[PDB]
Design an enzyme around this catalytic site. Structure first.
Site, PDB file in Angstrom:
ATOM      1  CB  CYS A  83      -1.049  -0.123   1.110  1.00  0.00           C
ATOM      2  SG  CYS A  83      -0.353  -0.525   2.755  1.00  0.00           S
ATOM      3  CD  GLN A  92      -1.068   2.367   8.523  1.00  0.00           C
ATOM      4  OE1 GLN A  92      -1.791   2.250   7.524  1.00  0.00           O
ATOM      5  NE2 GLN A  92      -0.148   3.307   8.595  1.00  0.00           N
ATOM      6  NE  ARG A 101      -5.714   2.149   2.095  1.00  0.00           N
ATOM      7  CZ  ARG A 101      -5.768   3.152   1.208  1.00  0.00           C
ATOM      8  NH1 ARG A 101      -5.453   2.944  -0.067  1.00  0.00           N
ATOM      9  NH2 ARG A 101      -6.095   4.375   1.616  1.00  0.00           N
ATOM     10  CB  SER A 102       0.005  -4.248   3.180  1.00  0.00           C
ATOM     11  OG  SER A 102       0.253  -3.573   1.944  1.00  0.00           O
TER      12      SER A 102
END
Ligand SMILES: CC(C)C(=O)N1CCC(Cc2ccccc2)CC1
EC number: 3.1.3.48
Length: 284
Positions: free
Chosen positions: A215, A262, A221-222
């Site tokens: 990402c 995150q 997201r990853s």
């Protein structure tokens, strides 16, 4: 504890921030001394996101072997992933060197090149068939072969040539194009469809090197992509699907790269994706 009941109990009690902070407090801390050497400052997008020394991917060259990329090896699930930052103007040649050297079949991209009016990664692949890219620092050529644009994702076929040996390989580029600029998707349906398309391609299978996932920082997201995939695979393999503990899987993956997932919203979205995903892996 069945995760769908754990889910409704955290929602009703509104404790997502407290659960997320407990993960942050328990997460592994390993050295990243190679990432912090002064010669590597322009190889890192973010000063606070670095690969651990024990799990970092090494480039096959004597000059400087460093790239901001980690090997996530999931022993029980029998899956491996490389998680990396979006490439920078001076690391696009390193990026394609890594794909070549690790024998990867697939690249998974979860960001747009521009988001929130700022650049989140270099334009690192060709946009037109007749305008190929040459990376002179690593001696590679990359050509666009075909492109299939759908409402939620784009799949591209690329040809990577090692100019030193004139060997060629086919790389598949899976580009999730609709993650919102702020927050997480309202429904996990298009993300799950996308994951199902990467799996169907062979890109995640043991006959190939690990899939490269990115990402912008290669942790948020990853992190969601690899966590959902591994959890759904373990629910298929075990006698009791209800034994799969998403918080314990995430802490295992955090042994290999810092900061995966995150925000509390990304943690809730990961639970949502695995729960809705389970309703077909169990026979539907
Ligand atoms: C036609 C059918 C097989 C299909 O497209 N899917 C994808 C969406 C859903 C959950 C899921 C499970 C595992 C990996 C990714 C997504 C159910 C299966």
């Amino acid at each position: 504890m069945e995760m769908e009941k754990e889910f409704e109990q955290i929602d009703k009690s509104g404790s997502w921030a407290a659960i997320y902070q407990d993960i942050r407090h328990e997460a592994s801390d390993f050295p990243s001394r190679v990432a912090k050497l002064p010669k590597n400052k322009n190889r890192n997008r973010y000063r606070d996101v670095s690969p651990f020394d024990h799990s970092r991917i090494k480039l096959h060259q004597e000059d400087n072997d460093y790239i901001n990329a980690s090997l996530i090896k999931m022993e029980e699930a029998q899956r491996s992933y490389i998680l990396t930052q979006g490439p920078l103007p001076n690391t696009v040649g390193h990026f394609w060197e890594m794909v070549w050297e690790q024998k990867s079949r697939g690249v998974v991209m979860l960001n747009r090149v521009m988001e929130k009016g700022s650049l989140k990664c270099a334009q690192y692949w060709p946009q037109k068939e007749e305008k190929e890219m040459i990376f002179e620092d690593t001696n590679l050529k990359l050509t666009l072969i075909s492109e299939d644009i759908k409402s939620y994702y784009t799949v591209r076929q690329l040809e990577l040539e090692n100019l030193t040996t004139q060997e060629t390989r086919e790389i598949l580029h899976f580009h999730y194009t609709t993650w919102p600029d702020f927050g997480v998707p309202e429904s996990p349906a298009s993300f799950l469809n996308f994951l199902f398309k990467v799996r169907e391609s062979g890109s995640l299978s043991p006959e190939h090197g690990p899939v490269v996932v990115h990402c912008s920082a290669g942790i948020g997201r990853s992190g969601t992509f690899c966590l959902a995939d591994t959890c759904l695979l373990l629910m298929d393999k075990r006698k009791d699907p209800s034994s799969v503990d998403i918080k314990k899987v995430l802490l295992e993956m955090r042994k290999f790269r810092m900061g995966l997932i995150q925000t509390a919203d990304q943690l809730r979205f990961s639970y949502l994706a695995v729960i809705e995903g389970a309703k077909f892996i169990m026979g539907d």
